[PDB]
Swiss-Prot record:
The lineage of its organism: Bacteria, Thermotogati, Deinococcota, Deinococci, Thermales. It comes from Thermus thermophilus (strain ATCC 27634 / DSM 579 / HB8). This is Methionine--tRNA ligase. It comes from the Bacteria. The keyword Signal does not apply. A motif ('KMSKS' region) lies at residues 297-301. Homodimer.
């Protein structure tokens, strides 16, 4: 009905080792879900894993394992990583789930009965040890990328989807809906792909070739290959046809992806929705690469690999999240490093927030008898209550670094304030104007803490604790001045961001 928010992350290849890229996307998606939930939105945040295929199939066989047991296991790697990263999703869809198979075959049967699926031949370079086709680029020019041996021209029997049939509609749709593909740069990219034929989409492979996957409803000897399987997780987790979740959130779909999978989401996916009679999504929000310190693509060979779990282990979940959301402008290729995380940590977190909280707590005991002073007026500091209104569009328009930059500037402004008023210098003259200054610092800290909660849930809740404030919050509470209550602060509180 009213305010509704829905965000998804791609579903990751189940046998892929969770990395910085996976981590980044899921962290951003989570900031968005957390932000809107705080803003009174009915929210649905979905993530998951891509569990089918033959390469995954072979991997399970090597260890003498049943494919289903092997995926129940290696899919836990992403689940553990999201726990570690403090990701609060609403659902984790796995492509082996029955509710997923039912939607896949349901939509395939729809498109099939409409006449958009036909049987033909797929010829081309092929590897018999891989049992998979490749292109000039794919095969390491001259041989197989995985087996390192010459490829062989071959034809295979497959079922196709009349994708080219929907290009003119897609093209005009994106032209008419300029904000569909978010960072503009990627919109033009896509619009260029649509200027030229996109061809038809091969959607299956013989089960004798790929036994692991969802079978075609009209031909059980054929398995759904990639596209109509993984792509349908966005509607399948919502129980697509009759589920109320579908009626509720789909109209607001926000897909978060890396540019690496831009064609499947910006070209394939949309034609599929059209053909299935399912509304289009609202926004495709495309992220760029997180380059190594050298500013070059992260590659082991290159030696510029930044592990998010080592950084996480060393500086905490909240610190890694803030840096990621603060250091990178979504959509832009940006180099990451531990030293950059470190300096942001010591400065933004350890110094700007942690220290002011501890020195303000110390000054409370000394000059206000260890309790929040009676509420006063914010004066110069009152403008912080209009930040929630400034950050909303920034956030919704994918400007997380700028949003965090403005909230943290208010915090810098808070330090500036106390250091400028000098509450210790004020106690001698007027201890009232000494307490008023301190109350303005507390209230301002309360407000800023709410703003930073979606990026650092636990620590901001803890900060609230260290000052004796209401722990659980809402964004609206940050729009009114004077809500910090003059009660006693805890006699003891650890250091928010400990020295690393
Ligand atoms: Zn091969």
């Amino acid at each position: 009905m009213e305010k509704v928010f829905y965000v998804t992350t791609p579903i990751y290849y189940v046998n892929a080792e969770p990395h910085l890229g996976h981590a980044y996307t899921t962290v951003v998606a989570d900031f968005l879900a957390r932000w809107h939930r705080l803003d009174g939105y009915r929210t649905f945040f979905l993530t998951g894993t891509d569990e089918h295929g033959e390469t995954v199939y072979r991997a399970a066989q090597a260890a003498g394992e049943d494919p289903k047991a092997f995926v129940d296991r290696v899919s836990g790697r992403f689940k553990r990583a999201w726990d570690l990263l403090g990701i609060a999703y609403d659902d984790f869809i796995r492509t082996t789930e029955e509710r997923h198979k039912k939607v896949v075959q349901l939509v395939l049967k729809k498109v099939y009965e409409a006449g958009d699926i036909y049987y033909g031949e797929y010829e081309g370079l092929y590897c018999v040890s891989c049992e998979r086709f490749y292109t000039e680029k794919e095969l390491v020019e001259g041989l197989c990328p995985i087996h390192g041996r010459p490829v062989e021209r071959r034809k295979e029997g497959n079922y196709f989807f009349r994708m080219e049939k929907y290009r003119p509609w897609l093209q005009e749709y994106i032209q008419e809906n300029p904000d569909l593909i978010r960072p503009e740069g990627y919109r033009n990219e896509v619009l260029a792909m649509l200027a030229e034929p996109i061809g038809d989409l091969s959607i299956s492979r013989p089960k004798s070739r790929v036994p692991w996957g969802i079978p075609l409803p009209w031909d059980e000897n054929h398995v759904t290959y990639v596209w109509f399987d993984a792509l349908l997780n966005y509607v399948s987790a919502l129980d697509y046809p009759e589920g109320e979740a579908y009626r509720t959130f789909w109209p607001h779909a926000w897909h978060l992806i890396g540019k690496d999978i831009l064609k499947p989401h910006a070209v394939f996916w949309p034609t599929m929705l059209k053909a299935a009679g399912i509304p289009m999504y609202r926004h495709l929000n495309v992220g760029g690469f997180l380059l190594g310190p050298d500013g070059r693509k992260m590659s082991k060979t290159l030696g510029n690999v930044v592990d998010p779990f080592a950084l996480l282990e060393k500086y905490g979940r909240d610190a890694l999240r803030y840096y990621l959301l603060r250091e990178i402008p979504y959509g832009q290729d940006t180099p990451v490093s531990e030293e950059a995380l470190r300096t942001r940590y010591e400065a933004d977190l350890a110094d700007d927030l942690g220290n002011l909280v501890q020195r303000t707590r110390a000054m409370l005991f000394r000059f206000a008898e260890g309790r929040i002073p009676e509420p006063v007026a914010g004066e110069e500091l009152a403008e912080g209550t209009g930040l929630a209104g400034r950050l909303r569009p920034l956030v919704r328009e994918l400007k997380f670094h700028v949003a965090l930059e403005e909230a943290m500037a208010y915090v810098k402004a808070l330090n500036r304030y106390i250091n400028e008023k000098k509450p210790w210098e004020l106690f001698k003259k007027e201890p009232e104007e000494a307490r008023a200054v301190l109350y303005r610092v507390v209230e301002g800290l309360r407000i800023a803490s709410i703003l930073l909660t979606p990026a650092m849930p636990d620590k901001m809740a803890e900060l609230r604790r260290a000052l004796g404030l209401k722990e659980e919050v809402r964004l609206e509470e940050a729009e009114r001045w004077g809500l910090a209550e003059p009660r006693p602060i805890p006699e003891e509180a650890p250091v928010l961001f400990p020295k690393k």
